[PDB]
Write a protein that binds this ligand. Structure first.
Ligand SMILES: *[C@@H]1O[C@H](CO)[C@@H](O)[C@H](O)[C@H]1NC(C)=O
Lengths: 49, 48, 48
């Protein structure tokens, strides 16, 4: 019976924009999408434990 | 070399650490890619 | 009692032998790792 997954953490800026500062500045206009993403990932991480 | 710097190799702009590569490019190859098509290595146009 | 103990020991030995011989027995547990790895790989590939 499986019991837990691998706890994954995703960094928005590195993935979407990489090293592009201008993209990072533009990404701020999209709101709290990354806050929701990281909150969900953290919830899954604590759920595994 | 060996420092996080902003580089521009023939228009290939980016930020990272440049290190002496040890992967054997063939003479006809002048630009490398990693998974997801990201540029992993490049040969210097001035000294190759 | 002796027969029951012998049966239990033989069953445990057969369990070990079956686990060693059959590499696909733990497929249900390798499936989660494979799925996570595939998800990460497709996420990385989407950057291209
Ligand atoms: C680049 O040009 C300079 C000036 O002409 C010369 O001294 C040098 O040898 C050249 N190097 C290469 C690799 O062409």
């Amino acid at each position: 019976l499986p019991v837990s997954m691998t706890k994954t953490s995703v960094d928005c800026t590195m993935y979407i924009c990489g090293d592009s500062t201008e993209c990072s500045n533009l990404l701020l206009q999209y709101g709290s999408f990354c806050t929701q993403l990281k909150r969900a990932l953290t919830g899954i991480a604590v759920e595994q434990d | 070399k060996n420092k996080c710097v902003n580089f521009n190799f023939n228009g290939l702009k980016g930020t990272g650490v440049l290190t002496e590569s040890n992967k054997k490019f063939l003479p006809f190859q002048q630009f490398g890619r990693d998974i997801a098509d990201t540029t992993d290595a490049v040969r210097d146009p001035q000294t190759l | 009692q002796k027969l029951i103990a012998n049966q239990f020991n033989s069953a445990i030995g057969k369990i070990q032998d079956s686990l060693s011989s059959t590499a696909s027995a733990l497929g249900k547990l390798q499936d989660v790792v494979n799925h996570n790895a595939q998800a990460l790989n497709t996420l990385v590939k989407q950057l291209s």
